[PDB]
């Protein structure tokens, strides 16, 4: 969410950008193409030399959309709906790339707005661009009634084993992605550890609660959202690693139930849980 203060900061900053928005848009893409050359894979049809009309035109269109977004900051999904459809259904840019363009737009503004780019305004602009990116990728895949049905079917089949599977998921995570161990320095992480079994059951129980409240997850998970944002402070990238390891765990235990369509529904459900758990971080 964008605080009221955030919105005020973005408007001030973007107002300063003024009639330069297009130029700055073209600059941000040029910086991205140079710093992160994999992003050029989405523009093979473009002359990407410096100052090309295609790049300038892209920068201007992107700039117009951000202005639109800023002017309708309390109604972004609706304001950008045509743009979210287009990226989800036609362009199909991998979501990671939105982070990269956001970083280069931040660099561009920093380089052109010495007076205005204070720490707080930096913070607000970053949050704003993350919000835009979220909106632009929102329709790539809300859980449909089929997803909801699939998630209840598979989780119902986990049943009393929920806790054991949560523990296995953490063990898989710790072995596969050793950096996640940095959040548990106070634990015995050996195989069989009762501390890891206890962690697994608590997470499993929370997931059971989320399945039961699949249409009211922000409230059902609100105390846990608080705890991770303000106390535990787990970097958001780690939630994706645990989600992959829960999927692997379910796959190895539910051969008949883990169909392609159920796998897709589970991946969407864990991403939504992950979104809710990191929603109060900033």
């Amino acid at each position: 969410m964008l605080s009221p203060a955030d919105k005020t900061n973005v408007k001030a900053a973007w107002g300063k950008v003024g009639a330069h928005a297009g130029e700055y848009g073209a600059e941000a893409f040029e910086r991205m193409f140079l710093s992160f050359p994999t992003t050029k894979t989405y523009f093979p049809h473009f002359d990407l030399s410096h100052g090309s009309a295609q790049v300038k035109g892209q920068g201007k269109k992107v700039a117009d959309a951000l202005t639109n977004a800023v002017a309708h900051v309390d109604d972004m999904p609706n304001a950008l709906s045509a743009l979210s459809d287009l990226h989800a259904h036609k362009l199909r840019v991998d979501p990671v790339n939105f982070k990269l363009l956001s970083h280069c737009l931040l660099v561009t503004l920093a380089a052109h707005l010495p007076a205005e780019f204070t720490p707080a305004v930096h913070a607000s602009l970053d949050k704003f661009l993350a919000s835009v990116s979220t909106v632009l990728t929102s329709k790539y895949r809300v859980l449909s009634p089929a997803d909801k049905t699939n998630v209840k079917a598979a989780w119902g089949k986990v049943g009393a084993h929920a806790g054991e599977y949560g523990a296995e998921a953490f063990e898989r995570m710790f072995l596969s992605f050793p950096t996640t161990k940095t959040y548990f320095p106070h634990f015995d992480l050996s195989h069989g550890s009762a501390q890891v079994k206890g962690q697994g059951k608590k997470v499993a129980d929370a997931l059971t609660n989320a399945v039961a409240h699949v249409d009211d997850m922000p409230n059902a998970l609100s105390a846990l959202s608080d705890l991770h944002a303000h106390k535990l402070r787990v970097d958001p990238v780690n939630f994706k690693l645990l989600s992959h390891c829960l999927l692997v765990t379910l796959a190895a235990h539910l051969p008949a139930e883990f169909t392609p369509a159920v796998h897709a529904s589970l991946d969407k459900f864990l991403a939504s849980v992950s979104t809710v758990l990191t929603s109060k971080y900033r």
Binding site: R92, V93, D94, H244, T259
Partner: protein, 146 residues
Amino acid sequence: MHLTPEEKSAVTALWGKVNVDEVGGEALGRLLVVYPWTQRFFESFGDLSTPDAVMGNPKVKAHGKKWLGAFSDGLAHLDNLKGTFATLSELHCDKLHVDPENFRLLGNVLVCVLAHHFGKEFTPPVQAAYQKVVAGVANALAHKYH
């Protein structure tokens, strides 16, 4: 790349049991269903609108055979993945224009499929070894991008 004796033994033993034909099509199919924006590279494969349509698509199965075959020949050269995949790296960048992020996604789905197919035999330490390998292959395939 570097793997302990235990890690390489785990990878090697499991792989002896993999039907490359079937696992390759399953993994690519699930990629297309779970991350549908990846369908952008396969517009000529025809109908991929539903999971069932994707999984039974003949061009999906055939291409499945193709990529996992090259993956398997990679497992015979785990000490020089970059040299092994150099030409295909170039091909995916300059000719196919594939965002390297997709290599990581396909890597993770393959791991999911190995778990699904092998169940309890796909233990946490065997998964760990396979996650190293898939990351090393993704890194090798992205190496020549410019």
